[PDB]
Design a protein around this nucleic acid. Structure first.
Ligand SMILES: [K+]
Ligand SMILES: [Mg+2]
Ligand SMILES: [Mg+2]
Ligand SMILES: [Mg+2]
Ligand SMILES: [Mg+2]
Ligand SMILES: [Mg+2]
Ligand SMILES: [Mg+2]
Ligand SMILES: [Mg+2]
Ligand SMILES: [Mg+2]
Ligand SMILES: [Mg+2]
Ligand SMILES: [Mg+2]
Ligand SMILES: [Mg+2]
Ligand SMILES: [Mg+2]
Ligand SMILES: [Mg+2]
Ligand SMILES: [Mg+2]
Ligand SMILES: [Mg+2]
Ligand SMILES: [Mg+2]
Ligand SMILES: [Mg+2]
Ligand SMILES: [Mg+2]
Lengths: 101, 119, 73, 88
RNA sequence: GUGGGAGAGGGUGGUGGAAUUCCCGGAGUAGCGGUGAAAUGCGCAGAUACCGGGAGGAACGCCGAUGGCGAAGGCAGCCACCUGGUCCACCCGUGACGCUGAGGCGCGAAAGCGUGGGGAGCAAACCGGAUUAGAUACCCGGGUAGUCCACGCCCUAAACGAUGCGCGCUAGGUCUCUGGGUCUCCUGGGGGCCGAAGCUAACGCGUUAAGCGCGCCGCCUGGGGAGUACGGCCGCAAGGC
């Protein structure tokens, strides 16, 4: 397996029932594609730069994971199925690189 | 007949002409003008002077609709784009801000043979 | 031609590889969206080359601006 | 690709004696590994010519080391071939 | 072999925003467009300019360079996956396994051919408008193949560094990309510039040789007739060798 970071930008206009729904769906999909989670950061509502799906805000989540690279791409696809998921950027994680250090 | 009084003025400046549009705060136009609106016919429509008279015509018509203070948006590069903003500042309309919105692609489309050595 | 100081010279010890951090990266952009040149960013060839990709990532994620509008023209 | 313990596992299989990472045997084996991987990747991706070049090269290196081996020790060559299931 | 590295090297799938075109909707009215100046053209069936929504194709601003990678053609949004080449350090392993290379085989810009797709912008041909003594042409408005994709052909070029590949030797200076280091600097590998010696008809080249050598391949032998004729071979043809 290899170590990635899944990025989810969601629809801020969700209340708790529906946020619960999307979370359940996502983490059940990560479970199904064999991605062991490590750290997760929920950054929540943030003011975008340019509007994504007519909306000025976005709901930010960051999941550091590890998984079967041959399947990574498909995971991405499943994660994009929902209407309420506005952006998915999965990047292959790598170590920090510095300046003014 | 709307009595707007707070608005936008989009100056669009080509090489072959100039034209102004004065719109409501939401983007819906109210009045407009251009080098052809005022007298000019041929190339002449893209002069600085044409630009002046144009801009001023629009602003006049706006103050007829009841307009007082406007924000400027400027699209394009042509002689007397700046003169258009000039007649707009000398208009008697209070100009809240000038802003340049001139659109450029991020290398999108093939241009005409005149415009080539770009993409 | 882009003459004052070196965006890096005033900044902490900061990840050039973090697409998620706007407030640092913002300082590497212009009045317009445009990614800043070396003259301003004052980085290394390789540093700049990183900041590029991490910016564009940030953009696609919807954090940094893709383009902007010039004020007071 | 070939990960580290894969490659190693191939060397510790083909090593003429402990610590030999370099012998002609280990080279032909390691090559042969990379080659088979490559042509597998080239079963699909028929359109990828640039990797094919590398393959032509890898292969040439293999045949080169073999012509050395058989010039040298026919016994060990023949054995190395029979053990690799190659040529043909 | 081990351990580090940089990279528009390649192939596949996905995805992003800017712009153009087009359609829908709001508002708005008399022109817009285009040129040296014009006209063809579009516009009261409401155009251009302005806002909002949709669709689709193609390319990828800033970063971007005098940069990088690639054997060459050539390669530029971002992401993942598949994969090639390459550099450095360590001095670990094999033990001359090397170099070149007529045939062969493979790749090979663009245009072009075949069969299906696709088609926004641009556009040979073409349709018009102008300009001139005439205008075919340049300039303007339209526009078809094509440009895009898949699979298969075609094999050309200012396919250029107009400079075959490999190795060894022969002052330096400066700029730079990328490794290692006792990190002003030194060392390796790329990209430029100026110059020893030397070379060169000159221009110029000069540790990225066009210098001093050796190995091997390709090629040259006045100009036109000519990349023509005849013959062969390849090609669906075009045409190529
Ligand atoms: K013939
Ligand atoms: Mg690449
Ligand atoms: Mg008419
Ligand atoms: Mg269409
Ligand atoms: Mg540039
Ligand atoms: Mg690689
Ligand atoms: Mg040793
Ligand atoms: Mg020995
Ligand atoms: Mg070709
Ligand atoms: Mg073609
Ligand atoms: Mg065709
Ligand atoms: Mg056209
Ligand atoms: Mg034309
Ligand atoms: Mg050098
Ligand atoms: Mg150097
Ligand atoms: Mg010189
Ligand atoms: Mg001399
Ligand atoms: Mg003769
Ligand atoms: Mg010929």
């Amino acid at each position: 397996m290899r170590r990635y970071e899944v990025n989810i930008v969601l629809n801020p206009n969700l209340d708790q029932s529906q946020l619960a729904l999307e979370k359940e769906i996502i983490q059940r999909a990560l479970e199904n594609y064999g991605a062991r989670v490590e750290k997760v950061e929920e950054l929540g509502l943030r003011r975008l730069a340019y509007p994504i799906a007519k909306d000025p805000q976005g709901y930010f989540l960051w999941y550091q994971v590890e998984m079967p690279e041959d399947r990574v791409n498909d995971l991405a696809r499943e994660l994009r199925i929902r209407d309420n998921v506005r952006r998915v950027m999965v990047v292959k994680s790598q170590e920090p690189f510095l300046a003014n250090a | 007949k709307r009595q707007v009084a707070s608005g936008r003025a989009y100056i669009h400046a080509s090489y072959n002409n100039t034209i102004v549009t004065i719109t409501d705060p939401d983007g819906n136009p109210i009045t407009w003008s251009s080098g052809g609106v005022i007298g000019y016919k041929g190339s002449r429509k893209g002069t600085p002077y044409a630009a002046q008279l144009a801009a001023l015509d629009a602003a006049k018509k706006a103050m007829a609709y009841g307009m007082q203070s406007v924000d400027v948006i400027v699209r394009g590069t042509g002689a007397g784009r700046e003169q258009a903003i000039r007649a707009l500042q000398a208009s008697g309309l209070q100009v809240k801000s000038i802003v340049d919105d001139t659109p450029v692609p991020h290398n999108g489309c093939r241009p005409k043979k005149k415009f080539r050595k770009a993409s | 031609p882009s003459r004052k100081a070196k965006v890096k010279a005033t900044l902490g010890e900061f990840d050039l590889r973090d697409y998620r951090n706007v407030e640092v990266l913002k300082r590497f952009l212009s009045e317009t969206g445009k990614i800043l040149p070396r003259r301003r960013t004052g980085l290394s060839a390789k540093e700049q080359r990183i900041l590029a990709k991490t910016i564009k990532r940030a953009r696609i994620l919807g954090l940094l601006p893709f383009t902007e509008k010039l004020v007071r023209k | 690709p070939i990960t580290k313990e894969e490659k190693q596992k191939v060397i510790q299989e083909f090593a003429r004696f402990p610590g030999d990472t370099g012998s002609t045997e280990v080279q032909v084996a390691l090559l042969t590994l990379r080659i088979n991987r490559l042509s597998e990747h080239l079963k699909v991706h028929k359109k990828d010519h640039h990797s094919h070049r590398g393959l032509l090269m890898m292969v040439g290196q293999r045949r080169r080391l073999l012509r050395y081996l058989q010039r040298e020790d026919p016994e060990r060559y023949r054995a190395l071939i029979e053990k690799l299931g190659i040529r043909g």
